[PDB]
Structures are given as C-alpha cells and as structure tokens.
Subunit: 48 residues, 2 copies
C-alpha cells in the first residue's frame, strides 16, 4: 500500500514537470515579444 | 527494494522540479521588468 500511493505521486510530479515545461517555452516567447517590443520603441526614440 | 528506489526517485526527480520553477520565476521578473521598462520609456517619449 506504500507502493501504490506514492506511485500516484510520481505520476503527478512527473506530470507537473511536463506541464511546467509548457510555460518555459511560452514565457520565453513573452521575453521574445517583450524585448522586441521595446527595441522598435527604443529605435523611434533615437531617430527622434 | 523497489519502494526504496522510488524513494530515491521521488527526491531526485524533485531535484529537477526545483530547478524548473527557479527558471519560471526568472522569466516572470524578466517579463515583469520589461513591461515596466517600456512603460517608463512611454512617459518621456511624449516629453521629448
């Protein structure tokens, strides 16, 4: 019974790793968007 | 013996899940400071 209930734990904790991964590439794409959002806005500053 | 290995496995897989949450906060403060940087430069754009 100890084996049964912690196998459920290594089910979900390995499940959290594969779902915590999906916001690693997603909030990389935020930093892809955010740094590129300022870059044009930095560019319009200096030409002004 | 196999519940001992999962006892090793539940902590060494936990050793990665601490690192992956350590990264997801880092992109959070990065994207957090980025939206505050562009909100800062949005002010003096009109001033200039």
């Amino acid at each position: 019974s100890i084996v049964s209930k912690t196998q459920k734990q290594i089910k979900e904790l390995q499940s959290r790793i594969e779902e915590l991964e999906e916001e690693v590439e997603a909030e990389r794409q935020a930093r892809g968007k955010a740094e590129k959002q300022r870059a044009d806005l930095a560019r319009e500053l200096e030409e002004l």
